[model samples]
Target: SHMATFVELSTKAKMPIVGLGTWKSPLGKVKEAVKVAIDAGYRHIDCAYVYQNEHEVGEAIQEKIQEKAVKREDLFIVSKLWPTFFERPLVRKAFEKTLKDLKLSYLDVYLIHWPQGFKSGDDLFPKDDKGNAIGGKATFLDAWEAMEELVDEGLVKALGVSNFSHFQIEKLLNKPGLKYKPVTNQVECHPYLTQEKLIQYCHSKGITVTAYSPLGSPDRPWAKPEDPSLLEDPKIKEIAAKHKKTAAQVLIRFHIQRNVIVIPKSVTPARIVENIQVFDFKLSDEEMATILSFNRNWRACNVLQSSHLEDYPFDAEY
Candidate 1:
């Protein structure tokens, strides 16, 4: 395995360029996968309260620490504040729960999972009788102010926003008495959704971009059979053959070349190890552009259930 590279955030916190994404990773399998990732040289792990498997992930980390495979300080753990906990009071309560579940005193980076707030409750996605997702009165702005306090209190090192638009971030920056600016914006990025404009904009504001679903999130629960498959694309396959790598590697390398943090989720032990073997290869400028040209503005994780909300982020061009 190759050494993971680091990205310097606005707060001077170092973030690993490649991390093990635990999004769709099942409960029984994710624990072993995290253990494998740590043994295979993965120092960063992406998690969220909505994943409902933090306790398992935490146990794996503790086992690794007990065995001296890696210390808590050597790793960067990233988690998100789920939409259901978007209010000021709920934000603090949510952070504490994540800490307790992950068995950590603090987080490296805590993100607002999404801009749209869900109805506050235990149900991950509160819905009305009509089947539409119920919206909460609390907004990201309200949640962010509370998040800034966490940083002050040493609960989190930096703050970030996931699935946020440039305009939404700008509003956050302009918030009066803003104590901390978001260090990164985690968005669904892949060749099909290059996110070039969004990445450029975030960079201009000193915000790094983290690419989730870097392999196009093929296992996303809502995926359709007819949707385009990134790993099976002939162009990517051709590039992979040229480099003697898997198409997944080609897709992951594309983001690496662009200096974007990419988290490719997988529970298969072999695949998890293979995903991080990308630092050894380099993509040519022409090949990078060729991959970038594949962008069709497609998104595999678009949450249409909340698209009707006034704060829906996907309506923006970027």
Candidate 2:
């Protein structure tokens, strides 16, 4: 099993392709989970300030760095810029706050968490009474310019966007005075929702695709109890049984074979290690196609249809 490394940022630093995702893992459980992941040969950690657990996460990283378990340069740490922080003047200030909170000098990758922006004084999911996004006046191009400045100021090594469509990314690429292009696009990619068009577009631009929820995000709050179980898919089960692997293992290996970075979230110690053990196996072409064909456009994290907020990503399609 050859170890896979992350692509270097648009700058020169490297990122690990198979990083640990920390979304929605209970606050009480994440601290210990971070410790276990560090001990299990994980060099990348994906986080967001909005997750509300960076303090504990920072403690784990600090303790690990102090104990000589890993060096600051050896780890590829990523955090996101939330929509609330998208105001022109507040953008850099938000990033500085994140750096201070994480007890880190800088981020390896700082992503604009979404293409959409929010009103100046809104909480997590703000909207107008008519359900339109309250205040999304600023275009993403303005935000992209702000992100480019982050690299100039040395706040972040690389810049990227998450949950962006092909058209949105093209717009950013065409902006003026662009010091750097987005090196990656983080999206809710999984076997159930392969994101074929978006993934292909990113690859065409030399931008890496980081697959969030690669295991179907079974724990997401909005997941219905009666939703079809991705982990239990018979085709995946057959492949896993043949390789003597878990369904999760099959999913991770599938992404690895396609050259996509995967961030599968897990709070359990054993599962964290298991998620990264994807380096050991390879999926055959037939197996890969089988998994790809499972794409039913079954998106687990639909930004456009989200009732909590307006200006969902899929609004144009619907």
Candidate 3:
């Protein structure tokens, strides 16, 4: 049987079940990695303005497109709107900066990045006078309305939300005059933190789920030595050994088997090529059941301690 795929933004287009995530990829290494991924046959690349390396990523994309390695239309590019641009009025301006920085005319999909509106504290969301957050009073509905305007203006082909909960998406669905429903909710999903409830809810609503940090993000500087090891998991290693594949390959195959989009980040040429090769194999029903049983609700990138000054989105009961 053919590997399952999903159409992003438009019904006519299709995105591979797996994609390459570009967060935390150093600026110096991104261009080469992107070039290598393109040469290796990857069509989907997940990006964000916060990564602070889109200029280089954009240059690589342009070079690849010019070389006929891949056409602009053949790639699926996904980016996010920073919290600073959550106000309805600044939405288009934010996207324009992204397009300019990425050297692209438009994006395949643009996401909200996070559901929480911020008061100016970080570079992405600066505060206004009187110490108030720019979009502090603005609801996500306001942001969604702005995103719909971008689609109307043809600046983005599709718009969706990231780090959004079922409650957050429900609010957007209830908003009047909403022209575009979020097609997916990109979140930190992996073997340990399967996010079963959220993924199931989005699936029920016909919204796709994109799993970020699908490989456990071991490269992150803050990752503690004591943190649970995903790549070295006994169950995953057992499956990989049985299939003669890397544990990374087995983990990615697990997600594909479950019908969620998996975006694994890597900038090394060897790993970049390795990350996308999961399409060649399939996981058995028993293996899938065993992998599913390993879910520990472990999250790798929770901002509970960040300066955001808000309750974490995943705090409540599942």
Best by TM-score: 1
Candidate 2, overall lDDT? 0.80
TM value for model 3 = 0.91
Please give each candidate's TM-score.
Answer: 0.98, 0.93, 0.91
Which lDDT values do the candidates have, in the order given?
0.91, 0.80, 0.80
Question: How do all the candidates rank in terms of TM-score, highest first?
Answer: 1, 2, 3
Model 3 lDDT tens row, 197-254: 9989988887888888888999877899999989988889989999899999898888
Q: List the residue pairs that clash in candidate 1.
A: none
Tens-digit lDDT string for candidate 2 (1-318): 224556655556677888888889787888888888888988888999778787778888899999998899888888998887786777877788778877898888889887777765537667667665555566566777787787888878888888888877777888777778888899888788888888888888888889998888888888887876788888898999999899999988887777888888899988988888877778888889988998877778764444344444554331
Instruction: Kindly give the number of clashing pairs for every candidate.
Output: 0, 3, 3
RMSD (Cα, Å) for all candidates, in order, is 1.0, 2.4, 3.3
Stretches of candidate 2 off by over 4 Å are: 1-3, 8-12, 130-132, 303-312, 315-318
lDDT of 1 at 74: 85
Kindly list the per-residue Cα lDDT of model 1 for residues 33-150, writing each as its tens digit: 9999999999989999989899899999989999998988889999999989988999999899899998898899999999988899878889888778889989898999899999
Error of 1 at 279 (Å): 1.0
Error of 3 at 318 (Å): 4.8
Q: How far is candidate 2 from the true structure (C-alpha RMSD, Å)?
A: 2.4
